[PDB]
Design a protein around this ligand. Structure first.
Ligand SMILES: CN1CCC(N(C)Cc2cc(I)cc(I)c2O)CC1
Ligand SMILES: [Zn+2]
Length: 195
């Protein structure tokens, strides 16, 4: 099967937000609204904002999962390549096979689906810090888009779902991801191509 990628705000008005980081050659993570695509370096912090219109119930959670963007690859589980799954760069919580990690959240849980074999990482939905209007989750992507035997140059999407305590759907959003050495240059290039 294939997880849905349909944008759905739901009862709570759920959607994502991204910082405006620019495209200098030194940038480590940058988001393109025109492409709905995040460009980031290997294992670097990717701040993703969560926005809602109203407060969801206690026990609400936020899950991230990657899928291949191209239909002919959609049924294939997105996972780390044969090199990176064995490089012992564990943070003590994320399984070494998982592409997406959450940084600095001890309540993060990593799922290997018993039926689809797909990977995801899920955290409790938390209110903004005092003085802030949204909550930020810090993600890491642990393989390059180009990794042989892994993504192998195939584009992926990250799907973020807002879930109730049973795992039922409350909201959904998504964005394409390219993990690369020079996010600034590649974003500039792909945006120029689009024009
Ligand atoms: C005001 N908000 C509607 C409060 C609020 C609560 C939770 I839990 C998560 C988020 I993002 C949030 O903005
Ligand atoms: Zn890799």
């Amino acid at each position: 099967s294939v997880p849905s990628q349909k944008t759905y705000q739901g009862s709570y008005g759920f959607r994502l937000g991204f910082l405006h980081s620019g495209t200098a050659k030194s940038v480590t993570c940058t988001y393109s609204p025109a492409l709905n695509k995040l460009f980031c370096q290997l294992a670097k912090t990717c701040p993703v904002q969560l926005w809602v219109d109203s407060t969801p119930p206690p026990g609400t959670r936020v899950r991230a999962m990657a899928i291949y963007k191209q239909s002919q690859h959609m049924t294939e589980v997105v996972r780390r390549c044969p090199h990176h799954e064995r490089c012992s760069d564990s943070d003590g919580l994320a399984p070494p096979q998982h592409l997406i990690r959450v940084e600095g959240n001890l309540r993060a849980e990593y799922l290997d689906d018993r039926n689809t074999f797909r990977h995801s990482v899920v955290v409790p939905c938390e209110p903004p810090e005092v003085g802030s209007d949204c909550t930020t989750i810090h993600y890491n992507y642990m393989c390059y888009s180009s990794c042989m035997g892994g993504m192998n140059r195939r584009p992926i999407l990250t799907i973020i779902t807002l879930e109730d305590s049973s795992g039922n759907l409350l909201g959904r959003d998504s964005f394409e991801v390219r993990v690369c050495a020079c996010p600034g240059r590649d974003r500039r290039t792909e945006e120029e191509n689009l024009r």
